[PDB]
Design a binder for this molecule. Sequence first.
Ligand code: HEM
Ligand code: HEM
Ligand code: HEM
Ligand code: HEM
Ligand code: CL
Ligand code: CL
Ligand code: MG
Ligand code: NA
Ligand code: NA
Ligand code: NA
Ligand code: NA
Ligand code: NA
Ligand code: NA
Ligand code: NA
Ligand code: NA
Ligand code: NA
Lengths: 138, 138, 138, 138, 138, 139, 138, 138
Amino acid sequence: VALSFHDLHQLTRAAVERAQQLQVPVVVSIVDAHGTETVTWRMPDALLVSSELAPKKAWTAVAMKTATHELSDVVQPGAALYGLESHLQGKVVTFGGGYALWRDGILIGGLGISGGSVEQDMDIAQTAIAAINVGTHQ
Amino acid sequence: VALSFHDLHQLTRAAVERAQQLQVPVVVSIVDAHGTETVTWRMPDALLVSSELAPKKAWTAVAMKTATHELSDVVQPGAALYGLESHLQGKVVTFGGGYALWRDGILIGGLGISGGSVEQDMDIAQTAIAAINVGTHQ
Amino acid sequence: VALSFHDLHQLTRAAVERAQQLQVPVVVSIVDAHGTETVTWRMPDALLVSSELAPKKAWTAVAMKTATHELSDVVQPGAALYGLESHLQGKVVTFGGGYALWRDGILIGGLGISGGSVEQDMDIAQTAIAAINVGTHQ
Amino acid sequence: VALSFHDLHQLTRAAVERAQQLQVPVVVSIVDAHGTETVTWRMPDALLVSSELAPKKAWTAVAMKTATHELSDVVQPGAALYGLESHLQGKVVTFGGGYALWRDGILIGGLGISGGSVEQDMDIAQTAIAAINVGTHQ
Amino acid sequence: VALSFHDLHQLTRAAVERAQQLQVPVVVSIVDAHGTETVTWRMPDALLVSSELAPKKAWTAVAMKTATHELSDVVQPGAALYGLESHLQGKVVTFGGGYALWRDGILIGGLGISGGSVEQDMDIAQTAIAAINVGTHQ
Amino acid sequence: PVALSFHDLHQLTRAAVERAQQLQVPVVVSIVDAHGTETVTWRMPDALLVSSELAPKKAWTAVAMKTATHELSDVVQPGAALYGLESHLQGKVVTFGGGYALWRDGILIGGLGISGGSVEQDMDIAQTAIAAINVGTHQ
Amino acid sequence: VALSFHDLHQLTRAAVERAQQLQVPVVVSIVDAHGTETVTWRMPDALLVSSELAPKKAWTAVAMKTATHELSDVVQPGAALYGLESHLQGKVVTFGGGYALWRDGILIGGLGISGGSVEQDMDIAQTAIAAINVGTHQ
Amino acid sequence: VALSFHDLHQLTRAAVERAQQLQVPVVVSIVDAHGTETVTWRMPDALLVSSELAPKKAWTAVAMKTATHELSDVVQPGAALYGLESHLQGKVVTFGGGYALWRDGILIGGLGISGGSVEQDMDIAQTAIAAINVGTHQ
Ligand code: HEM
Ligand code: HEM
Ligand code: HEM
Ligand code: HEM
Ligand SMILES: [Cl-]
Ligand SMILES: [Cl-]
Ligand SMILES: [Mg+2]
Ligand code: NA
Ligand code: NA
Ligand code: NA
Ligand code: NA
Ligand code: NA
Ligand code: NA
Ligand code: NA
Ligand code: NA
Ligand code: NA
């Protein structure tokens, strides 16, 4: 059930291809179900911050079993998990671009994209994920 | 006056059993009156973030002599301790799930639960604390 | 011009005496004009967090040539230095209890109190400062 | 295209000269297109916090290809990159004083000023940048 | 194959019992096959350092697939992995008391003991491991 | 003209993984550019957890010191010129083998780092991968 | 059983007085039995490193229940706890100047001095300890 | 008694000029008597490590009141300050290239050079120091 070589290779290829179509250089990061960095690819000229944000988005997706855009409302002032980003010492990113990857009810990894607008990062991520046979929810 | 073996054992057992009833895997953490990690137990499949949040809640409860849900208002924009989570470099958690433990007016420890919704974490924590009948306020 | 032995000893004594009158245990911290820790004194049962907050308040006062309560408005959402506490990795504290210490137009140090309410910490600090011949503004 | 000795020297001198005119001591920092510290200069009595803020402003400008005052709106509560300063563990500063430096469509570095009001920092930075043959936008 | 509740409970009980027989208080730590803290138990008056060293020994065992005493020679001056403890920022401990736990050729976790002499820690760890049906090599 | 291309990165990464498969040792492969930025990472199943940190560090060291990492082993020993270096740089530099600096036409273009086997295996894997593309390991 | 006001005061005074006699400026640090910083005093012109070394020496004494000079042999290459200083991320200091304080078989705190030679730090620490009624071994 | 503008400028220029004569690109760093970074200059293509080592050598010179080559013997296995580089969490560098700057018996700052061989760094640093009216010992 885990991510196979083919899964990893296709996710990464499809993300890079979609980023090229959008004309935005990104960092692509994939983590396994335990949060271990498994693939990283940086396109030329990607924003330097993206080297830290993409793997953090992928990690966040696994570590909270969620897509990172789904955390945006819950960390606001007044919301249930206000302060989370400081409580976890910057390890969680709470804007879009990270998705949890599921197969047959089992969490198999996380994908993180950074380098565009949040909308671009999410488009790239969703396009990549559509290239392989996986879900973004259990 | 201090947490005995029986206190630590029953707090842990009761927390895990309540979490089983709720069908949510959590990390349980107990710290002593000086904030030293005394017991940690991770249920299978608990959110990875919970491994950091539960001990931090337990620590926060002792370090601020308060339940963590009682810090939620006082760290908001405009409130007296705005910014506290950054000032203490992520050591304090300001949402529910941590309680201070008191016996005969003496602070004896802190219990932290993380892995569910905030309300679940607080339910589990309160249940565990009710199993040994210590107080949560001086 | 600098804090003398007598300055340091009287500041510390007066802060502790005032805390005793208020019946709240605090940490007292004094830093020099360069931000080096010079005196620390912890009263029994002071909040654990105060061991970190009091020196940070003192340091903040010198590092920003201000009282720490004067930073509260400027770090709010919408205000000029929003985010400051993260930018400086938790070294600055932006609620009351730290004061800059000045003599003959020269910055000689900083005093930080933590362990009570913000208002108690500011009272203690102001009382201590009144015990020696120094100002809180240039 | 890169920053020459002359570019660095003129930037630094013009910044210091403008700060002297404003009668505010600042830290001046210049990073290259990869974010490596290239020049630092501290004026006597500059706020201690400026030693950390000015290089961070310069680094931010390259790392996000933006002037730092342009990030102020996008990190607010409710905005698209809320929490960014914690996600990047304090490496990015999101109030004014940092500018990205461009020549012939190529990013050649970043300039950061800290020590005055945000407006003084920006005036100093803009004055310095006007002393050499560069743009602040691609 | 993984560590069951019974495995974890017996390891912990047996380590504590052995420590009691030796009259030395220890910290017991167990990590899973991915290095995630699963159980921590601190006996009263265990050396404060043991709170950091026991989990690090358990983690090292899984992270290097080795008992920690088997790393002592290989990190010495002149040996193949000299400097390893600094390369990994203190995450690995290279003296005895940590053991990797294997069942049917599969790595299922790590156990770490700290609080005694290295020889006591190893005794305690070996005694605990003998209480369950597992090997210390693949 | 001489930077690492897509093809360079791809071939380095593939050849490293292929060689690690031949040796039957799972590794982490890391490539950094001439400025030390992480460019590629690839982790093989069951690689030592430590190798997730050690491989990118090796690659970064190679560029940050313009050297192969095995060439630092003597110089950081007790009594040698750069004793303590690993602590001075807060663990960012690794001083045993497996990292190589990558050069073309006298220009530094990147760094490759391998971790997960013995130090010898990591070097073998790195050298094999480097041979798949025609760059040099010295200026 | 604990360090009283009189104990803390006399330790600190006696350490400063001795350091004055020797004409070496030091930092004095005292921690309680849980390792919490209780007193710090810095003499003018004390080595900057001493602001970190002295509290660490005091902490190490309690955390390891030993004098710090007693750790020097055991951390050497080839000895049982080689690497310890990196394993504990610099929290332990292994050269002289820190002493564990005992009364009636109970560990009550730790004293740390830094700023002279190791031998001066030890002379100062020992002179200070001799000013109160305590032992340096259980 | 302090480093003037001219002192800072001349030190920096002379260091860069000597590095050019040796044909090695270095990072030059100057700190004041309190260890605050005052000047940094990076020559093109200086080793990336030098960006961290040169300011650390300058800081070390002031923080230990010594040239950094004078620390080499004292931090060896078997010597009085073995482990120091870890105790201070990498803030001190114990090989040559850093010098303390003294005028009329007063410590006024530190100069640090990194990028060459240790001998080249020391040559550069000594040459720069010779360009102004200061000593390297009290
Ligand atoms: C921060 C790093 C700096 C470095 C490395 C530096 C380096 C130098 C060097 C190498 C020269 C000689 C140029 C030549 O080769 O002929 C020079 C000249 C000079 N620098 Fe600087 N400088 C620095 C900053 C400044 C600053 C901040 C000022 C004034 C605010 C200043 C004022 C001058 C003056 C007046 C000259 C003489 C010629 C001229 O007016 O342009 N320099 N500097
Ligand atoms: C540290 C030393 C520990 C000791 C000495 C210990 C001892 C025991 C004993 C004597 C029992 C009674 C049942 C029997 O006859 O086997 C027991 C039950 C139990 N303990 Fe512990 N325990 C320890 C730690 C833990 C921890 C950390 C947990 C975490 C949840 C735990 C969970 C339980 C549970 C759930 C039971 C009752 C259910 C069952 O045994 O199947 N114990 N323990
Ligand atoms: C890590 C990031 C990787 C990316 C972005 C990536 C991307 C690609 C792309 C774009 C192609 C088609 C290129 C072409 O031939 O025209 C390709 C082909 C291929 N890749 Fe990868 N790849 C990666 C890693 C790997 C690894 C680690 C392996 C093997 C261990 C691998 C094996 C292959 C093979 C066997 C082919 C087809 C053979 C051929 O090109 O004729 N790739 N990859
Ligand atoms: C660091 C925290 C210190 C605190 C909180 C403190 C507090 C006090 C207090 C409350 C007294 C009155 C004692 C009594 O008679 O009951 C006192 C007296 C004294 N202290 Fe301290 N003290 C401190 C440090 C020092 C140091 C470092 C020295 C000398 C190096 C010192 C020298 C004295 C002397 C000589 C007296 C007797 C003269 C007088 O009453 O002013 N103290 N201190
Ligand atoms: Cl915030
Ligand atoms: Cl070492
Ligand atoms: Mg049950
Ligand atoms: Na926050
Ligand atoms: Na905050
Ligand atoms: Na009971
Ligand atoms: Na913030
Ligand atoms: Na934030
Ligand atoms: Na080391
Ligand atoms: Na070292
Ligand atoms: Na070490
Ligand atoms: Na060391």
